[PDB]
Design a protein around this ligand. Structure first.
Ligand SMILES: [Ca+2]
Lengths: 94, 97
C-alpha cells in the first residue's frame, strides 16, 4: 500500500477525526495511565490511513464478486488475506 | 447463545467522519451497507486499542507513565504496519515545526 498526502485548500487541518474521542478510546484500557498530547495527533492520521486501506481491500473483494455495494463479507475477506489485519478476525469473522 | 450489550457512542469515531473517508477511496456511485459502516467503525476502535496496548506494555516494562508519539510509532512498527511509518513520521515532524 502506498499512502500519499494530498495538500488541499478546503481542509481546515491535516486530520479530520476528533482527538478527544481517540483519547477516550485509548483510556478504556485501565492499564493506560498517561497519554502525551501528541499520541492522539498521530492516531488521528493513522486511523484515516487505516480506514482507507481496509475500505480499499474490502472493495477489491466487492469488485471481484461483480457487486457495487460494499458488504460485511467483503470486509471479512480483506481481514482474512491481509496479515496486518489479523488482529481483526474475531471482530469480523464473516 | 446470546446476551445484550450497550454500544456507547463515545467509544467509537463518529460515523459521519468515518463514512466520509470511506467514500474518498471508493468510486462515486459505490454503495456501503449499514452493517459495513458499523463494522468499519468498530475496526477503527480495535485498531487504536491494539496499537495502544503494545505501546503501553513497553512503557510498563520500562517503568514509564506516559505514552509518547514515539511509543506509538514504535508499536505500529513492531506490529508490522510498515507502510504507515514514514508518512506518520513526516506528519509528526511537520506538526512539531
Ligand atoms: Ca506478513
Amino acid at each position: 500500500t502506498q499512502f500519499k498526502e494530498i495538500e488541499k485548500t478546503t481542509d481546515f487541518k491535516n486530520h479530520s477525526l476528533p482527538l478527544a474521542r481517540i483519547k477516550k478510546i485509548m483510556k478504556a484500557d485501565e492499564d493506560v495511565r498517561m497519554i502525551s498530547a501528541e499520541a492522539p495527533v498521530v492516531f488521528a492520521r493513522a486511523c484515516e490511513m487505516f480506514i482507507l486501506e481496509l475500505t480499499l481491500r474490502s472493495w477489491n473483494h466487492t469488485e471481484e464478486n461483480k457487486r457495487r455495494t460494499l458488504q460485511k463479507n467483503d470486509i471479512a475477506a480483506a481481514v482474512t488475506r491481509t496479515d496486518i489485519f489479523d488482529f481483526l478476525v474475531d471482530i469480523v469473522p464473516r | 447463545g446470546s446476551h445484550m450489550t450497550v454500544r456507547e457512542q463515545d467509544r467509537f469515531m463518529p460515523i459521519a467522519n468515518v463514512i466520509r473517508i470511506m467514500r474518498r477511496i471508493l468510486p462515486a456511485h459505490a454503495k456501503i451497507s449499514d452493517d459495513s459502516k458499523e463494522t468499519i467503525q468498530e475496526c477503527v476502535s480495535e485498531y487504536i486499542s491494539f496499537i495502544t496496548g503494545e505501546a503501553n506494555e513497553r512503557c510498563q516494562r520500562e517503568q514509564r507513565k506516559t505514552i509518547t508519539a514515539e511509543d506509538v510509532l514504535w508499536a505500529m512498527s513492531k506490529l508490522g504496519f510498515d507502510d504507515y511509518i514514514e508518512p506518520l513520521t513526516l506528519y509528526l515532524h511537520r506538526y512539531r515545526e
